[PDB]
């Protein structure tokens, strides 16, 4: 599969009268899940669990209600796997990948925010055709090209192209010019937006240069960030 961040407290217990929630996001067999854990660090049982996502850039929405049809007892801890889809109300957020969430129990409604790792939103179908890559790279306005440095990374081209493909970032073509390795790479997000990349590897220096061309280039920062976490874990 792709890279999955270890979960992280999203809702501290002290901010929700003992209800602690922690989570991550996954993309497995082309379906997106919010992978949660609820722990009851409160004095009494918790019931009537429910979830709502607010309006967000990628129009992310759960596919079912929260399936925890159970009383959550003190010091009890459970893993919930909430399926998601991107058919819901869209609205460009700041930061672009911030999701506002509200969880309800018998006690109250609690609000929290978390950042969707953009790689879970990369679709299985992001491998551009080479001539189409060529022409599209030529096509995107040239001020829509952005340059990034992948720091202290020591993996070779094969390993980089391998890791990256596990996350639906495709390696279209490979060019070795001047002992510097060059990888051409497309990815497609869930809202259709393409990201084309040229990644540049050179023995000697443990810093990779990442050239991203996207039609909405405000995305590209978040794409690099994801390149960085992928190639570092």
């Amino acid at each position: 599969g792709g890279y999955v961040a270890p979960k992280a407290v999203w809702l501290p217990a002290v901010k929700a009268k003992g209800l602690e929630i922690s989570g991550t996001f996954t993309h497995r067999q082309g379906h997106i899940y919010m992978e949660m854990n609820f722990t009851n660090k409160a004095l009494q049982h918790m019931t009537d669990f429910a979830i709502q996502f607010n309006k967000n850039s990628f129009g992310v929405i759960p596919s079912t209600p929260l399936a925890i049809h159970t009383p959550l007892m003190p010091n009890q801890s459970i893993d919930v796997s909430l399926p998601l889809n991107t058919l819901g109300p869209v609205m460009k957020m700041e930061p672009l990948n911030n999701l506002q969430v509200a969880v309800k129990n018998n006690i109250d409604v609690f609000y929290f925010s978390c950042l969707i790792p953009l790689n879970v939103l990369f679709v299985e179908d992001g491998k551009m055709e080479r001539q189409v890559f060529l022409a599209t790279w030529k096509d995107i306005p040239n001020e829509n090209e952005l340059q990034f440095q992948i720091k202290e990374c020591h993996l070779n081209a094969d390993t980089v192209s391998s890791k990256l493909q596990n996350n639906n970032v495709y390696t279209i073509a490979k060019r070795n010019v001047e002992g510097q390795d060059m990888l051409y790479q497309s990815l497609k997000l869930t809202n259709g937006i393409w990201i084309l990349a040229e990644l540049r590897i050179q023995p000697g220096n443990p810093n990779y240069t990442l050239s991203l061309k996207c039609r909405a280039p405000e995305v590209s920062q978040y794409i690099y960030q994801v390149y960085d976490s992928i190639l570092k874990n």
Binding site: N54, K55, V109
Partner: peptide, 11 residues
Amino acid sequence: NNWADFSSTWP
């Protein structure tokens, strides 16, 4: 900030 619903009747 109160964007969420959760109403006990809802049909």
